Design a protein around this nucleic acid. Structure first.
Ligand code: MG
Ligand code: MG
Ligand code: MG
Ligand code: MG
Ligand code: MG
Ligand code: MG
Ligand code: MG
Ligand code: MG
Ligand code: MG
Ligand code: MG
Ligand code: MG
Ligand code: MG
Ligand code: MG
Ligand code: MG
Ligand code: MG
Ligand code: MG
Ligand code: MG
Lengths: 227, 945, 258
RNA sequence: GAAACUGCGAAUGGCUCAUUAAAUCAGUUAUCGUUUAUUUGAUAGUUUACAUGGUAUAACUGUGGUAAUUCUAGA
RNA sequence: AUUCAUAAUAACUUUUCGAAUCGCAUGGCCUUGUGCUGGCGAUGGUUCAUUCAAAUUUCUGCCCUAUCAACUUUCGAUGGUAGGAUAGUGGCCUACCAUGGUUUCAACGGGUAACGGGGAAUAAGGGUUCGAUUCCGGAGAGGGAGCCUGAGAAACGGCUACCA
């Protein structure tokens, strides 16, 4: 079966087709999350460690973690689970999924290189893929560049160059959770509103108390007159 | 905001800010070609609009105005006879400042002037005052449409009374000074346009009187308002100028060049010229350009020599050289200005000419151009030259500035030798200025300075400064510099065994003077105190690279076997450049030794070279992980091990998160090579933030050299280039401060980042066993409570503390550490901390001690820490006679823990309803405890007091 | 149905809106608001079918989004905002102020008012109750909650609310001899004086009302709204002064004026 | 301003009369027997801060399975 | 009409809420600091009231059939008590109790080419028939059963089984 091997430290990934069945047998009986030695797979992978991440069968159905079987089964999948993207809120669908036990009928098996062996794979270890996007939140920028609190993230924003025909310019992200005078103004405005509301309520309460006291005194005077 | 609504959305209705409407609004009624009601008339303009406005506007205020005036406006003779009451009502109603009636009133006020204009003159002053108050009122209630009505009303009156106002403009301007001088920019901008329309309609004779008055006023926002006024009068349509522009522009120039007119007026003229130059195309400027040349030629004189040059500087700069038709004319002026001043202004002028001149004209005049500079700018030719280089260095080199610089140096080396040193210092780093460094230097100066070292007194920092600025110039000297240097270096080394920062840089300068063995011996004798300095490290790098390996060398370095290991200590420094140069030095020394350079050395050099970017972020990590693997698999000697381990900790100083990833992965698997070496490196980093590092550098005697180099320009573009030129002048004005200030900039970085302690702690966390064995060195911080120190100078951050406590829990045998008991008591203090996270770390380390009784009740204590399960545990775990209660035999060990954990929970701010019940529960469990334990709990509360 | 309805057929719409039965299939459903559905006049019907300012719904939306219409001194932008009894509609651009009052026929009538009379409204006190923290408050017929009322104010009284501050300026007790306005039933729109209140515990109270023409009628208490003392209304009344006229007399008057 | 996340709607509208004989429905009552998005009006000094995390992912880059579907797996 | 509104006392909570949100604009104080203070709006948020609603609910009113006279009660039928559940009352369900409930004033059972009403036709008046069908209310989405989401669904141009 095809092996889709991914090296996350480079971010690289490549497919290797397999014909001999010795390596395929040593993959058998394993489970997602378990580790296997690359030397058993072949000399090219000697010294490597592969963690199984999943796979697809000859019918295209995916492998699901948490179900310990060697055969497909129809599972009721819901929000925030693998192998299912709900079209509508609260929608739950029963779909056929392949078990978590490796077997002879896996069309492709996905592997993650936990540890590098002595020899360097041509397509995985020798090459690197850059990160697509840099940090956006201010604290993330500080963490990425290890900035001090005093140092302003404004000067450390990553810029990417875009060239259109003869023209050229740069694009950079909008920082979020940045301390700006507008935020201070909003905070101050909320605090002032709160205090003013409290004072107005107290004033209204005092006025009502005075009115009630005056009415009470008048009624008591009338009662005294009746006596 | 900059990116205006340039790309328009498909929406039919869209919000527009009040500022946005004000920005696009423009006061110019003539452009509007829409049919106007008053254009068709039967009796008078006032009646025609009046009937229309009765129909459209239904506002209450306008309705009352209509009723009061309806009878008196039926016929034009009626209007003229009753004009006094008509004007009063219009002004009376406008005063209320009601928006819903303002539009008909402002229109009718204009049409009222149209019907009886010459008669309006007696009303003219009252009208403008009414409008000024209305516009001033309009600022409070933001309504762009109101401003459109008011200013158009002003424009219409200004249109109808054109002949009579034009005769007395300075009076009319006087009324509008508060508007033109107003703080808000847009009010001044609008009033400038309305007033501008009269300016275009002037007789030239009347204009000169008007131009004189405003310039007299010119000597808040008046400058800006006038600038908008004149430029508006010049511009009529895009890429074109009004026909009268030449007449007005001549009048402004003649007044500006006049001695009586203030200098700021010439500055205004400069700003006016640039606005029109940017606005207008080439052809429209040709009539304007011609008048400028002729007027300058006709009025050239000593008194106005400075003013003329100031305007010419603007012309050459304005939109660079593309607006200029033919530079031969401007050149023909320049000798006339030269033949018949302010040196700094001249230097400003020629530099732009070099940058902006077409190739042909510059070639014809490049020789005469610089000869003028030697004539009068020789006092400041170098300030000109550096500015010329920055603007266009390639053009200066192409046009033979270098030989003229060489001629300059010969003429004035005696006068301003220090100032020459400043120039060659600043240009040193720039690779494009390599040709300047190639310029041969006058020989006589070299000998005079050469004689200085041969007999120089060097006993104090001031004398060193004398050597320093001189030392820079010898680098170009060709008269066997080596022989003079060696005695001087020995004098410097012996005189100052303990160098300060300035000294380390001079020797680097001195070593840099060398060009293609005894000197090498000299530096080796005294280098331990100079390895830190970058400049010394470069100068040494230059020396070793030049010199060819030989057997005699192998004897030399053999005399100092510790040379290689000593230099390795530079790799922990916070500067990338120092580490790179040290590596390059390391390789060269091995070549001289003949020893083979390890391949690890080459790999580390490559990593340092890679730029620190997101694109290369990943590539850096693998190189660290690869070489770390290379170091691990390959057995090496102490020097390689010392080299690599120190280099790794140097990477921790780097401010790049990907770099940290590789080293944090590499270091835990390679520390076995030298367990002692890593620990000292970790130990030192922990103590760096507490250690105080200050850069103390020699302060030269202060120079009080400063002056207003150029005039101030409102326009940003011209003002920036002025700021650049002034910055250069001030730098050269104070040569002593400038030389030192430039020097400190290029030394490098010596201040470790304050986060370095956290990085070292992460290394300590990854390897608890090494910390456990070397607890003797780390113990004192805990007993100080992680406080420098009774007032505290400083303390560790909460993050640093947390990583430390986690490491303690990871110790396999905490009980057998150097001081277990004193540690054991302090963790009890931390167990009393209010912060629950701290207690869990404190407890985990406490449980690291193998005590059976604690192990029996470990989970209950953990649940007590856990916020969710704190409440039920109190009832179950601590109730007297409880099934899960602590056994009497085991109480004595467990209760001290129980007392301390509860103490922190009592310190929770008793602030929210859940948090308040928590405090009540803590105090409510006291009766369960035996009285001696209750006494202990009370004792803890009073301990802090 | 499985939830709240959002459509209103024209035939099912309130009669007093006077909607053409063949213009379309649907009618404006008043959104939730101060007044009940059947006793409210949405702004669309008021601006289009009564004032004739707008020719169709889209122009009404154009008017509202311009923020020219104010209800009770506050700008509204919902086309189906349920304006109702005693609500002040201000159109500043036209310099017009309207108070929604039923005419004798039982329909909302376009009544123009002065600005001063537009400065306040009248509200029937539907509830008097202590809120949280022991603060008395009154709920009126239009859903306004006003805190710290005058203690003498009781249910079924009338309170004169100043729109600017939303506070009670004065109040009228529900007593015999007071001038009242009918706001429900077949007697809708009539004006009279109270004569006597019949009380029936656990049932609907009845009120006898005598008109200026000495005709008398009985109405449920929920449909009565005190508007002032006899001859001294606190608001300007529409034409006809709430007097019901027989069909024959209406014919005579119509022929005479024509 | 595509895509995607987020919020809201999709329980309205339209169609049909199968079941349903104190059931539905009509008129008339009650919630002191209860929920109520939304609208409208009130209403909360008592709770590193110049402002916290991934305890995190989509869209996106890249590597793939199935004959096939508004299928989706690893990084 | 209340154990109502509200308040207070003592505790309790895997326990909430009490603005880490956004647009436009740049006013006022000065000890001149990117110091302090400040406007017009949007969107969120506890509780109360109002509104659109929802649920249950009191009294009266339905065509033919007595050659359907007794029905309901074991497996809830009537009622009491306590609990569970419900948004909530309630045999709605559970446990223990009693033996009740309707009926010749027609219960129960059967038929219905039975959705109900506003209405339509005829008739001089009483009556007789029609009303799937422009509005109101109820139920359904091939037939049963069961649910996620959401304030609101036993939803079906949402999902799951079984039957066809
Ligand atoms: Mg969504
Ligand atoms: Mg952009
Ligand atoms: Mg009642
Ligand atoms: Mg039946
Ligand atoms: Mg019934
Ligand atoms: Mg909504
Ligand atoms: Mg609200
Ligand atoms: Mg992923
Ligand atoms: Mg039972
Ligand atoms: Mg019960
Ligand atoms: Mg049927
Ligand atoms: Mg029928
Ligand atoms: Mg029907
Ligand atoms: Mg349904
Ligand atoms: Mg069908
Ligand atoms: Mg269904
Ligand atoms: Mg449907």
């Amino acid at each position: 079966m095809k092996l889709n091997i991914s090296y996350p430290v480079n971010g690289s990934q490549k497919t290797f087709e397999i014909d001999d069945e010795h390596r395929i047998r040593v993959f058998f009986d394993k489970r997602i999350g378990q580790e296997v030695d690359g030397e058993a797979v072949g000399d090219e992978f000697k010294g490597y460690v592969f963690k199984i991440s999943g796979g697809n069968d000859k019918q295209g159905f995916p492998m699901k973690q948490g179900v310990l079987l060697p055969t497909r089964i129809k599972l009721l999948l819901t929000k925030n689970v693998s192998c299912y993207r709900p079209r509508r809120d609260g929608e739950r669908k029963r779909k056929s999924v392949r078990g978590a036990i490796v077997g002879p009928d896996l069309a492709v098996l996905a592997l993650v290189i936990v540890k590098k062996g002595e020899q360097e794979l041509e397509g995985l270890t020798d090459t690197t893929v850059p990160k697509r996007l840099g940090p956006k939140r201010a604290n993330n920028i500080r963490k990425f560049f290890g900035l001090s609190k005093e140092d302003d993230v404004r000067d450390f924003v990553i810029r990417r160059e875009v060239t259109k025909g003869e023209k050229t310019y740069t694009k950079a992200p909008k920082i979020q959770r940045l301390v700006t005078p507008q935020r201070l103004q909003r905070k101050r405005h909320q605090r002032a509103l709160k205090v003013r509301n409290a004072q107005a309520q107290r004033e209204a309460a005092a006025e009502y108390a005075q009115l009630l006291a005056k009415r009470l005194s008048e009624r008591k005077a009338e009662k005294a007159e009746i006596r | 905001a900059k990116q205006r609504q340039t790309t328009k959305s498909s929406k039919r209705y869209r919000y527009s800010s009040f500022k946005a409407r004000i920005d696009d609004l423009k006061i110019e009624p003539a452009r509007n070609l829409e049919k106007r009601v008053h254009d068709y008339v039967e009796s008078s303009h006032f009646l025609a609009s009046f009937d229309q406005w009765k129909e459209i506007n239904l506002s209450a205020k306008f309705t009352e105005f209509a009723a009061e005036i309806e009878h008196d406006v039926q016929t034009l003779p009626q209007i003229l006879y009753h004009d006094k009451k008509i004007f009063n009502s219009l002004v009376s109603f406008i005063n209320f400042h009601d928006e819903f009636s303002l539009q008909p009133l402002l229109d009718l006020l204009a049409q009222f002037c149209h019907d009886l204009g010459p008669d309006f003159l007696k009303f003219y002053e009252e009208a403008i005052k009414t409008l000024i108050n209305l516009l001033d009122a309009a600022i409070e209630f933001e309504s762009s449409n109101v401003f459109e009505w008011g200013f158009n009303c002003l424009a219409y009156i200004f249109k109808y009374l054109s002949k009579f106002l034009v005769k007395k403009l300075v009076l009319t301007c006087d009324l509008l000074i508060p508007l033109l001088s107003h703080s808000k920019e847009y009010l001044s901008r609008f009033s400038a346009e309305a007033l501008s329309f009269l300016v275009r309609k002037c007789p030239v004779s009347n204009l000169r009187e008007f131009v004189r008055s405003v310039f007299e006023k010119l000597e808040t926002n008046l400058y800006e308002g006038l600038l908008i006024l004149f430029t508006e009068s010049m511009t009529s349509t895009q890429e074109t100028l009004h026909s009268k522009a030449k007449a007005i522009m001549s009048v402004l120039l003649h007044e500006a060049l006049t001695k009586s007119s203030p200098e700021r007026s010439v500055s205004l003229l400069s700003d006016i010229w640039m606005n029109i130059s940017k606005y207008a195309s080439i052809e429209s400027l040709l009539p304007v350009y011609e008048v400028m040349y002729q007027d300058f030629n006709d009025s050239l004189d000593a008194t106005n020599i400075d003013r003329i040059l100031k305007v010419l500087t603007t012309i050459v700069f304005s939109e660079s050289g593309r607006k200029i038709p033919d530079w031969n004319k401007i050149t023909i002026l320049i000798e006339r200005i030269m033949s018949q001043l302010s040196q700094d202004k001249v230097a400003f002028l020629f530099a732009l000419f070099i940058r902006n001149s077409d190739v042909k004209t510059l070639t014809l005049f490049h020789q005469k151009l610089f000869n003028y500079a030697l004539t009068n700018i020789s006092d400041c030719f170098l300030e000109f030259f550096q500015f010329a280089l920055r603007l266009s260095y390639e053009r200066v080199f192409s046009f033979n500035g270098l030989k003229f610089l060489q001629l300059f140096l010969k003429k004035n080396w005696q006068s301003q030798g220090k100032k020459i040193a400043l120039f060659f210092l600043e240009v040193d780093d720039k690779p494009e200025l390599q040709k300047v460094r190639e310029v041969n230097f006058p020989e006589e100066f070299i000998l005079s300075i050469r004689d200085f070292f041969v007999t120089a007194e060097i006993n104090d920092s001031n004398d060193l400064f004398e050597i320093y600025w001189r030392a820079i110039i010898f680098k170009y000297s060709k008269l066997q510099n080596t022989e003079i240097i060696i005695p001087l270096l020995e004098r410097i080394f012996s005189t100052f065994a303990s160098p300060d920062n300035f000294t380390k840089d001079m020797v680097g300068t001195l070593l840099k003077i060398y060009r293609k063995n005894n000197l090498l011996k000299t530096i080796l004798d005294n280098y331990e105190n100079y390895k830190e300095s970058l400049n010394f490290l470069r100068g040494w790098n230059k020396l070793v690279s030049n010199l060819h390996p030989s057997e005699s060398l192998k004897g030399l370095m053999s005399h100092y076997p510790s040379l290689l290991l000593s230099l390795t200590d530079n790799f922990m420094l916070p500067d990338g450049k120092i580490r790179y140069e040290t590596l390059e030095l390391m390789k060269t020394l091995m070549i001289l030794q003949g020893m083979q350079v390890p391949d690890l050395l080459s790999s580390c050099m490559v990593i340092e070279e890679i730029p620190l970017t997101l694109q290369n972020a990943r590539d850096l990590t693998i190189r660290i992980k690869n070489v770390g693997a290379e170091f691990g698999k390959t057995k090496t000697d102490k020097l390689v091990s010392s080299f690599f381990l120190k280099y790794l900790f140097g990477l921790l100083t780097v401010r790049f998160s990907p770099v940290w990833t590789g080293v944090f992965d590499t270091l835990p698997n390679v520390y076995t090579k030298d367990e002692a070496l890593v620990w000292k490196l970790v130990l030192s980093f922990i103590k760096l933030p507490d250690e105080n590092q200050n850069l103390d550098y020699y302060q030269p005697l202060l120079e009080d050299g400063a002056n207003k180099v150029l005039w101030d320009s409102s326009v940003v573009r011209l003002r920036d280039t002025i700021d650049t030129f002034s910055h250069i002048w001030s730098k050269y004005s104070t040569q002593n401060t400038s030389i030192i200030s430039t020097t400190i900039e290029r030394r490098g970085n010596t201040t470790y980042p304050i986060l370095i302690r956290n990085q070292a702690l992460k290394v300590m966390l990854s390897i608890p066993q090494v910390a456990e064995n070397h607890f003797v060195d780390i113990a004192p911080f805990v007993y100080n409570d992680f406080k420098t120190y009774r007032v505290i100078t400083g303390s560790w951050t909460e993050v640093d503390r947390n990583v430390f406590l986690k490491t303690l829990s990871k110790f396999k045998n905490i009980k057998n550490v150097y001081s277990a008991t004193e540690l054991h008591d302090h963790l009890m203090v931390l167990l009393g901390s209010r912060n629950t996270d701290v207690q869990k770390l404190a407890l985990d380390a406490l449980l690291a001690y193998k005590n059976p009784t604690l192990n029996k009740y470990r989970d209950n204590l953990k649940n007590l820490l856990d916020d969710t399960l704190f409440k039920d545990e109190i009832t179950t775990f601590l109730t007297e006679n409880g099934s899960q209660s602590i056994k009497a035999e085991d109480e004595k060990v467990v209760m001290p823990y129980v007392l301390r954990i509860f103490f922190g929970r009592a310190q929770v701010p008793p602030t929210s309803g859940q948090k308040r019940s928590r405090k009540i529960a803590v105090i409510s469990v006291l009766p369960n405890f035996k009285k001696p334990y209750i006494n202990d709990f009370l004792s803890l509360a009073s301990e802090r007091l | 149905a499985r939830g709240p309805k959002k459509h209103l057929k024209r035939l099912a719409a309130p009669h007093h809106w006077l909607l053409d039965k063949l213009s379309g299939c649907y009618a404006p459903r008043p959104s939730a608001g101060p007044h009940k559905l059947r006793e409210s006049l949405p702004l669309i019907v008021f601006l289009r079918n009564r004032l004739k300012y707008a020719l169709n719904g889209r122009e009404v939306k154009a008017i509202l989004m311009q923020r020219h219409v104010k209800v009770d001194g506050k700008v509204r932008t919902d086309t189906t905002y349920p304006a109702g009894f005693m609500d002040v509609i201000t159109l500043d651009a036209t310099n017009e102020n309207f108070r929604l009052v039923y005419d004798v026929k039982g329909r909302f009538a376009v009544h123009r008012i002065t600005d001063e009379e537009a400065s306040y409204k009248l509200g029937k006190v539907k509830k008097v109750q202590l809120g949280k923290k022991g603060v008395p408050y009154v709920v009126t017929h239009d859903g306004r909650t006003i805190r710290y009322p005058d203690p003498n104010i009781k249910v079924n009284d009338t309170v004169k609310i100043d729109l600017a501050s939303g506070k009670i300026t004065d109040f009228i007790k529900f007593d015999a001899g007071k001038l009242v306005y009918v706001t429900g039933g077949r007697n809708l729109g009539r004006i009279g004086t109270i004569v006597h209140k019949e009380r029936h515990d656990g049932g609907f109270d009845l009120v006898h009302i005598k008109d200026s023409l000495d005709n008398t009628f009985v109405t449920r208490l929920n449909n009565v709204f005190v508007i002032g003392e006899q001859g001294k209304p606190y608001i300007s009344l529409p034409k006809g002064k709430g007097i019901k006229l027989s069909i024959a007399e209406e014919r005579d008057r119509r022929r005479a004026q024509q």
